[PDB]
mmCIF file of C-alpha atoms in Angstrom:
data_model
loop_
_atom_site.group_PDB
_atom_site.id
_atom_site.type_symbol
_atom_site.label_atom_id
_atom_site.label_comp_id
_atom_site.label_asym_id
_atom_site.label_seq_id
_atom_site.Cartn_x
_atom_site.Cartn_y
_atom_site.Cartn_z
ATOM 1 C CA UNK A 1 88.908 276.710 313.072
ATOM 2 C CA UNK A 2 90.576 274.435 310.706
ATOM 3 C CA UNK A 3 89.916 270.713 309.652
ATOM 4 C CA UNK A 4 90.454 268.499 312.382
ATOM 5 C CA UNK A 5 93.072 265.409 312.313
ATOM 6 C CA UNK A 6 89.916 263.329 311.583
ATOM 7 C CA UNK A 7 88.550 265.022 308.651
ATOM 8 C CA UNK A 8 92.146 265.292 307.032
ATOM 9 C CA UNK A 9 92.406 261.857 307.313
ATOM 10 C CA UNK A 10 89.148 261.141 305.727
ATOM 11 C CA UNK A 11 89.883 263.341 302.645
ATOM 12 C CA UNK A 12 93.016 261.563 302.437
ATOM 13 C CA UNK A 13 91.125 258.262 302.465
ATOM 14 C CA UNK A 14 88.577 258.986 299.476
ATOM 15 C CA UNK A 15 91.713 260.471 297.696
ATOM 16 C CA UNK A 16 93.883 257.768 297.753
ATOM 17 C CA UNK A 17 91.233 255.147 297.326
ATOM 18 C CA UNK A 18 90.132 256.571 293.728
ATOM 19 C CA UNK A 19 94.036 257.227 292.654
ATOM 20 C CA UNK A 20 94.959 253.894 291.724
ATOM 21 C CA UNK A 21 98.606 255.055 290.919
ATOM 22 C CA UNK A 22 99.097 255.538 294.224
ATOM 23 C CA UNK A 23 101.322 258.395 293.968
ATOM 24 C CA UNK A 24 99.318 261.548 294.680
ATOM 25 C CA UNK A 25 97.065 262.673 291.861
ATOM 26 C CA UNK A 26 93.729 262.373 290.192
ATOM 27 C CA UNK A 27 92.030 263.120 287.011
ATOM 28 C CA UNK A 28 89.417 265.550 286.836
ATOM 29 C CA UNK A 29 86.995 262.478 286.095
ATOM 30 C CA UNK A 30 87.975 261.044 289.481
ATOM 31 C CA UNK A 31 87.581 264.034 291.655
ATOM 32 C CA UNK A 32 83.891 264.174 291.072
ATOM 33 C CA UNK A 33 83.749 260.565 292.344
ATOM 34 C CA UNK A 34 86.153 261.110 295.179
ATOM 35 C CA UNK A 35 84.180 264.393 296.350
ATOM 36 C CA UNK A 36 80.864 261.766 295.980
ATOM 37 C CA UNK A 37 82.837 259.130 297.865
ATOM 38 C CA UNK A 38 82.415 262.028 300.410
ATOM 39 C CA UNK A 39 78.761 262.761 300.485
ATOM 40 C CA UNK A 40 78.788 266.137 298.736
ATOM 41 C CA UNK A 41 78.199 265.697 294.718
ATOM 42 C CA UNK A 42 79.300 268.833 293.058
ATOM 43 C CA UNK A 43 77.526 270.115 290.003
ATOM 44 C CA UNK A 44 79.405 269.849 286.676
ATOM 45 C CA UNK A 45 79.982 273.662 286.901
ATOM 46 C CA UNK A 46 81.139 273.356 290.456
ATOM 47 C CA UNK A 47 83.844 270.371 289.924
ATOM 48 C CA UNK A 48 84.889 272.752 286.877
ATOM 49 C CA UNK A 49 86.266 275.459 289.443
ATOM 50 C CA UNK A 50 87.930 273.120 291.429
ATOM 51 C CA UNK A 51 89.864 271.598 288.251
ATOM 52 C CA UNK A 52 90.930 275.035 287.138
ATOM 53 C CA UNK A 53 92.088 276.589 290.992
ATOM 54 C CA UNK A 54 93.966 273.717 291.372
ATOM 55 C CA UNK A 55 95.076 272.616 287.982
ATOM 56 C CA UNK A 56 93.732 275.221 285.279
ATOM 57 C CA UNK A 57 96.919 274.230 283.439
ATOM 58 C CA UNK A 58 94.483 271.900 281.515
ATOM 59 C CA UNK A 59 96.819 269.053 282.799
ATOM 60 C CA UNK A 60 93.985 267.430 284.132
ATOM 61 C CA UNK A 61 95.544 266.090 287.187
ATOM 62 C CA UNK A 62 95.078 267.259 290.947
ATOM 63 C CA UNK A 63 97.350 266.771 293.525
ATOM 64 C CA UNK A 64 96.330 265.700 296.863
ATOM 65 C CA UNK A 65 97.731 268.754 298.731
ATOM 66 C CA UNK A 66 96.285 271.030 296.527
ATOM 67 C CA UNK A 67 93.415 269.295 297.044
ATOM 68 C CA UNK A 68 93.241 268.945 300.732
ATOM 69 C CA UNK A 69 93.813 272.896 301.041
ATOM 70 C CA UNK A 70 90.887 273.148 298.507
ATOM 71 C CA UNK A 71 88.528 271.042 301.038
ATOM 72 C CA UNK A 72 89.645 273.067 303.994
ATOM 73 C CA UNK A 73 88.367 276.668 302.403
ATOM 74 C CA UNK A 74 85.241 274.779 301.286
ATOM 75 C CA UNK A 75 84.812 272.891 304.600
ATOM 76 C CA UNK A 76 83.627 276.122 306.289
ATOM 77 C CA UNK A 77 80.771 276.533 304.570
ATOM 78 C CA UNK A 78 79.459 272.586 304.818
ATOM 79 C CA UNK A 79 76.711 271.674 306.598
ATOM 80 C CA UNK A 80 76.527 267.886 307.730
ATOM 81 C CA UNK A 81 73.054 267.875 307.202
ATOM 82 C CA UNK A 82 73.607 267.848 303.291
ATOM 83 C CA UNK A 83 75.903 265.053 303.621
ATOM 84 C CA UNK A 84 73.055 262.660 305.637
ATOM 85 C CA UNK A 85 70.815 263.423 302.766
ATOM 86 C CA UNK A 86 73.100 262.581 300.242
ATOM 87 C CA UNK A 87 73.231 258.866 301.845
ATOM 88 C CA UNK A 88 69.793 258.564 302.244
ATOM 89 C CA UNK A 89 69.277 259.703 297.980
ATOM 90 C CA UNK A 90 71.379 256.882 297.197
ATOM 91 C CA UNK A 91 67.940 254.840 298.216
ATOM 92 C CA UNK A 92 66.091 256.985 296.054
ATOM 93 C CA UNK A 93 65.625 255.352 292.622
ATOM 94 C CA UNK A 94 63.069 257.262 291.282
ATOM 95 C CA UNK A 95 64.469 260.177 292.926
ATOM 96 C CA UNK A 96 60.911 260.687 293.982
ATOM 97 C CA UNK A 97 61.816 261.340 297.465
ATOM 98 C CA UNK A 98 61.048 257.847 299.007
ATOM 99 C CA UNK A 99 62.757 255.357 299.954
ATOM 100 C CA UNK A 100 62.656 251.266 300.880
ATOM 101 C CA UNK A 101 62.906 251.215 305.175
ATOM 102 C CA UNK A 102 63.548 247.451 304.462
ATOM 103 C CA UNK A 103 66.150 248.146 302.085
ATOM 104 C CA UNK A 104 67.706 250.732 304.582
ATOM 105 C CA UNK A 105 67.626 248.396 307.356
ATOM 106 C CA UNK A 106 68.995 245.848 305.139
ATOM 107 C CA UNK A 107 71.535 247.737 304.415
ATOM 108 C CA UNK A 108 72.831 249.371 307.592
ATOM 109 C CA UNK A 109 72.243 246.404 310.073
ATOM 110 C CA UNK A 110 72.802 243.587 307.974
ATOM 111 C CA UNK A 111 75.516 244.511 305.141
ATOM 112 C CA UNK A 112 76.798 246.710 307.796
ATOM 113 C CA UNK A 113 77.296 244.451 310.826
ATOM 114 C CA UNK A 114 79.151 241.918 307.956
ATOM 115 C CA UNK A 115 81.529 244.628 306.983
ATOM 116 C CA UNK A 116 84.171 246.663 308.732
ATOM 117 C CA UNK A 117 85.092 249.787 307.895
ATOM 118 C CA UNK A 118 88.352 249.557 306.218
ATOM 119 C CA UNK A 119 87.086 246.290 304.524
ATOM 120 C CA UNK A 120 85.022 248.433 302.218
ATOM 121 C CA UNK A 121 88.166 250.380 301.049
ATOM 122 C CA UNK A 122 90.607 247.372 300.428
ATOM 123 C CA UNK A 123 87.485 245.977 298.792
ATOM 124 C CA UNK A 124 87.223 248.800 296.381
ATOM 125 C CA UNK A 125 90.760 249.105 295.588
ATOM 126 C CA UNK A 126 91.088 245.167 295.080
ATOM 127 C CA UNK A 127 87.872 245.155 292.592
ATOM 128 C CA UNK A 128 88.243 247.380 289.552
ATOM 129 C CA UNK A 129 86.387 250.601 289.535
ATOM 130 C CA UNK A 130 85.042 252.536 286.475
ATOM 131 C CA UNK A 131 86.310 255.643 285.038
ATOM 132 C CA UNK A 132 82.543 257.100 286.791
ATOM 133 C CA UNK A 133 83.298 254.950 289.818
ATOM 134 C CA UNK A 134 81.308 252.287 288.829
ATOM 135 C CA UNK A 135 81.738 248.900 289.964
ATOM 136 C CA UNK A 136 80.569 245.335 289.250
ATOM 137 C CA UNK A 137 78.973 244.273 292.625
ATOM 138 C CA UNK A 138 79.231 240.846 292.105
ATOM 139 C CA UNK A 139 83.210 241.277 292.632
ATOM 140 C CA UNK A 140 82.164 242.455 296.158
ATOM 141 C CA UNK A 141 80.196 239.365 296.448
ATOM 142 C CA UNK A 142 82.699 237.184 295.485
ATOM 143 C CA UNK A 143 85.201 238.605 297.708
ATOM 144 C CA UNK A 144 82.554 238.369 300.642
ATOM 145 C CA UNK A 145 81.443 235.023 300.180
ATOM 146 C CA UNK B 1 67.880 221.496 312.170
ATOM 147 C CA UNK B 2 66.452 224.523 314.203
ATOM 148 C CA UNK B 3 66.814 227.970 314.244
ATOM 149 C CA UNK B 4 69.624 229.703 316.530
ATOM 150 C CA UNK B 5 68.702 232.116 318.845
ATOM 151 C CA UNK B 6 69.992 235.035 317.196
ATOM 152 C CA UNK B 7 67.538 233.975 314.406
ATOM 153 C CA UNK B 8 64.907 233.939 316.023
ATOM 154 C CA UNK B 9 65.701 236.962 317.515
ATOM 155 C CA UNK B 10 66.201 239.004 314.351
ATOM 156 C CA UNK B 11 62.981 237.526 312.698
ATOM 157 C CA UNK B 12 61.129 239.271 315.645
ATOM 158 C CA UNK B 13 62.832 242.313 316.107
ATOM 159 C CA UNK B 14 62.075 242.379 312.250
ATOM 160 C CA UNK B 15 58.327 241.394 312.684
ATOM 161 C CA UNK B 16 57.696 243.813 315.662
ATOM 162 C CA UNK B 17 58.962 246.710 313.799
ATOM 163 C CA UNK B 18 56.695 246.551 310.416
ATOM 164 C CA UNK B 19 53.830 245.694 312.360
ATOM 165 C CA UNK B 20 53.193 249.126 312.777
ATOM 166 C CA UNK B 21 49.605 248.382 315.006
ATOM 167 C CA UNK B 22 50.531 246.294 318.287
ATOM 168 C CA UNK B 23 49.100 243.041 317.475
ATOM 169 C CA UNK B 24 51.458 240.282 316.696
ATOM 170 C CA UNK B 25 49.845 240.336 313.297
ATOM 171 C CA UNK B 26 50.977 241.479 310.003
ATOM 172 C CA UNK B 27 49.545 242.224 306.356
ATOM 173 C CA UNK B 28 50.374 240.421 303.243
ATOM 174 C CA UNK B 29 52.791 243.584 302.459
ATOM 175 C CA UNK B 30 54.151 244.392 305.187
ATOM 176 C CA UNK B 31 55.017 240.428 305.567
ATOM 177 C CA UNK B 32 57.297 241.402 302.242
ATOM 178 C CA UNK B 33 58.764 244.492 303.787
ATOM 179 C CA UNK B 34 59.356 242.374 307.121
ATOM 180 C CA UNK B 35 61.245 240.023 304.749
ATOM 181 C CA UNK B 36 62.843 242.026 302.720
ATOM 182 C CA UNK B 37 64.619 244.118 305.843
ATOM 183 C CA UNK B 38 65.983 240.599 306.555
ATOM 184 C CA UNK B 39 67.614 240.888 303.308
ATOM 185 C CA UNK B 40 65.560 238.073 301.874
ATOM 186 C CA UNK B 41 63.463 239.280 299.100
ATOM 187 C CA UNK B 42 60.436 236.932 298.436
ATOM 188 C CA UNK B 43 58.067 236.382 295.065
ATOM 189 C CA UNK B 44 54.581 237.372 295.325
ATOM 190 C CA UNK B 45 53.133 234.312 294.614
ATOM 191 C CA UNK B 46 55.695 233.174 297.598
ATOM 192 C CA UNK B 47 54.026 235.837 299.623
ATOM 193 C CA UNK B 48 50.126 235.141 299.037
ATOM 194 C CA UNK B 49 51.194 231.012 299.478
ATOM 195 C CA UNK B 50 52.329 232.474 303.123
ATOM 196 C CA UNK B 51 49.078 233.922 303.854
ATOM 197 C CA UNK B 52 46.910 231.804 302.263
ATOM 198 C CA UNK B 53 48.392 228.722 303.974
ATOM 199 C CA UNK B 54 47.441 230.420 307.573
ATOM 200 C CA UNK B 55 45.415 233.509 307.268
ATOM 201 C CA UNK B 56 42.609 231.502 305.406
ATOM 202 C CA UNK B 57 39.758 232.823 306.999
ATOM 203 C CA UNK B 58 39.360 235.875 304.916
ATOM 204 C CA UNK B 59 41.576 238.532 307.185
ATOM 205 C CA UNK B 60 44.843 238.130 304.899
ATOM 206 C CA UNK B 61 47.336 238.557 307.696
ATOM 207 C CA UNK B 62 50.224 236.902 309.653
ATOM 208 C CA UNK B 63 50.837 236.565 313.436
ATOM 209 C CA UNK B 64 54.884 235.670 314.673
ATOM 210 C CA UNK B 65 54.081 231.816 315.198
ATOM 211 C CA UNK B 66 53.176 231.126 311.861
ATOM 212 C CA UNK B 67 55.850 233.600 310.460
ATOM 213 C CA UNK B 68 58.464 231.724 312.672
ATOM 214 C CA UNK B 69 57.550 228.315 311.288
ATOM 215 C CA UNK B 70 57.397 229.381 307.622
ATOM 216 C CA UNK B 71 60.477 231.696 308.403
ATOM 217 C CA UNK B 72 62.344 227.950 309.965
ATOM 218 C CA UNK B 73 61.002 225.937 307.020
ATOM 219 C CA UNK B 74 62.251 228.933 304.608
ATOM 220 C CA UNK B 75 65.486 229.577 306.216
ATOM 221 C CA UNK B 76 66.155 225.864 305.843
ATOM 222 C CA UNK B 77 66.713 226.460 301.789
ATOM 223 C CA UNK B 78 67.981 230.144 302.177
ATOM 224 C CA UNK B 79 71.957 231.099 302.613
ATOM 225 C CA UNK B 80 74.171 234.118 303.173
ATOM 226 C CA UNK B 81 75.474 235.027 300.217
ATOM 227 C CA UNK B 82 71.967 236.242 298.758
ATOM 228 C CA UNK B 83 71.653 238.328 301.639
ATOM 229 C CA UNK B 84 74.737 239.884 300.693
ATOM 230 C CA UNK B 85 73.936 240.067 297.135
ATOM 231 C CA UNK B 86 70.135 241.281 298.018
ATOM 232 C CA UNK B 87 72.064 244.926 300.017
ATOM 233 C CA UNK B 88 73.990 245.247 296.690
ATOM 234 C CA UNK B 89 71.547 244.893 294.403
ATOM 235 C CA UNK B 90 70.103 248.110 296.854
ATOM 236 C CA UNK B 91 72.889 249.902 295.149
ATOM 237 C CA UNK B 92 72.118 249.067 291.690
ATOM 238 C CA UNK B 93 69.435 251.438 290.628
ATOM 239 C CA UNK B 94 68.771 250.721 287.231
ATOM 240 C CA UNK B 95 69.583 246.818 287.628
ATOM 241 C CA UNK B 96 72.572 246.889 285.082
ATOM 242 C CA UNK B 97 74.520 244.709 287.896
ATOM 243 C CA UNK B 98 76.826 247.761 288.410
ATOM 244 C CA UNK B 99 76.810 250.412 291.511
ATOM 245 C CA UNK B 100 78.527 253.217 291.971
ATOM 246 C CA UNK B 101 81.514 252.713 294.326
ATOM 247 C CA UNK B 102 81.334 256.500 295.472
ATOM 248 C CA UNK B 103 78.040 255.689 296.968
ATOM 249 C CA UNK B 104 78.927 252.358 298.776
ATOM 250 C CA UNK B 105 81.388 254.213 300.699
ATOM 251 C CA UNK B 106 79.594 257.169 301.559
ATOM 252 C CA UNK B 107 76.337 254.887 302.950
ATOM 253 C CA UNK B 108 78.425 252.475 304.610
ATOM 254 C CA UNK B 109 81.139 254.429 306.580
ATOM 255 C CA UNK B 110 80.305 258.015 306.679
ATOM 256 C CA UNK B 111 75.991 257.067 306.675
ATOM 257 C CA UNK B 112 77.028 253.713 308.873
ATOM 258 C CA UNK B 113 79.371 255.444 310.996
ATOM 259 C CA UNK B 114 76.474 258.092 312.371
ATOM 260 C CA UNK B 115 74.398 255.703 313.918
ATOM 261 C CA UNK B 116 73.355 252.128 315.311
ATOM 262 C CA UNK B 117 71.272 249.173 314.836
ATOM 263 C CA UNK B 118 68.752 250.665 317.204
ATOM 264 C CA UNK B 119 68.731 253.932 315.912
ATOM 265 C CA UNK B 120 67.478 252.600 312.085
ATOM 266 C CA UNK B 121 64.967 250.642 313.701
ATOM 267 C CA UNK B 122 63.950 253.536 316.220
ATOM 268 C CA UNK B 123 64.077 256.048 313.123
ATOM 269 C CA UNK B 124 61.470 253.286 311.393
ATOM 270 C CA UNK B 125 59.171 253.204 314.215
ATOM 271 C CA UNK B 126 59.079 257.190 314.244
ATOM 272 C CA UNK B 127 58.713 257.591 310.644
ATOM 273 C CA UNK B 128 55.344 257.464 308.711
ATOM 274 C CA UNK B 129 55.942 254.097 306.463
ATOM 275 C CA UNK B 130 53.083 253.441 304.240
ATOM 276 C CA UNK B 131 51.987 249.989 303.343
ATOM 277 C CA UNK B 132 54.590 249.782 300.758
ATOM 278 C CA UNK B 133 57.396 249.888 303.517
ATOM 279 C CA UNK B 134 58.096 253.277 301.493
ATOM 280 C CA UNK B 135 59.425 256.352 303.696
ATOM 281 C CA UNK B 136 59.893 259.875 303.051
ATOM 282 C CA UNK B 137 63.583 260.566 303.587
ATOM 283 C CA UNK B 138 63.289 263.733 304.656
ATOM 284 C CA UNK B 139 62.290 262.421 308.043
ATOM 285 C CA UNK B 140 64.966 260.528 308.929
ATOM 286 C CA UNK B 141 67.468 263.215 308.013
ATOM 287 C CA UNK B 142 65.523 265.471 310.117
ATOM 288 C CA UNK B 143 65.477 263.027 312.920
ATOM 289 C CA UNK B 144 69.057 262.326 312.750
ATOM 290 C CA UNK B 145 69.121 266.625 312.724
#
């Protein structure tokens, strides 16, 4: 029991969409984003581990096969009900455990229905991200509108 | 100029669903909620003028007729970029005008990918929503568990 053809080609997605070189390597700085990108934030300690059993070498850099054969070791013990919560904290402001149901809908039928999904990559890539994967939405807007 | 079809649909699908009693009648908040899951968010002195143009007589509450007309004359002077710009804005949690571009992707395809239109508003109706339109998360990962 391996990663299916699907889930390959989703790591490869969030991988290549936060390595704007386009070659096949990230930062350290970017992995945390691309695992987020994923819906499964890693602690500071955790990312740590990855950098060094991939790239201890303190280049920095991760390649993606190194990385996709790091995801497939981890990917055993990954439970899709933490990645569901993760979406549903990104609601969470106060990170008091609640949430806006208007905002949600908002969100998932509205924003949703306007969007396909592989406009929200070429969006991302086309706007320019952060060094945290921040972003200035009204780029998004602009692009939308 | 009157309101399509699909309009008026949505504005009552919307209604219906924050009107958590039965009774094609709403209160002054969850007329904001109702609004706001349309992607519309109002003022509150916008609000009470909405109620205390109709609902006059001391209950403080909305039925669908009136909310349709205000929601026609109100449409009239509303466009489709805000909507867009009100779901961003969901992302921006401390209102610096930037969100993070890990989370967009994770709530729109891997959060948007694991359910429908029906299914948020089903989830909604099943979860306990106080007057706020506020909702413990935890339920709808469970339900979606």
């Amino acid at each position: 029991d391996q990663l299916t053809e699907e889930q390959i080609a989703e790591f490869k997605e969030a991988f290549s969409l936060f390595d704007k070189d386009g070659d096949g390597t990230i930062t350290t700085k970017e992995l945390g984003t691309v695992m987020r990108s994923l819906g499964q934030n890693p602690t500071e300690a955790e990312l740590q581990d990855m950098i060094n059993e991939v790239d201890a070498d303190g280049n920095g850099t991760i390649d993606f096969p190194e990385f996709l054969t790091m995801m497939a070791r981890k990917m055993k013990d990954t439970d899709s009900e933490e990645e569901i919560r993760e979406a549903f904290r990104v609601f969470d402001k106060d990170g008091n455990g609640y949430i806006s149901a208007a905002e949600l809908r908002h969100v998932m039928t509205n924003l949703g229905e306007k969007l396909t999904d592989e406009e929200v990559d070429e969006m991302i890539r086309e706007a320019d991200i952060d060094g945290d994967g921040q972003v200035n939405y009204e780029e998004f807007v602009q692009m939308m509108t």
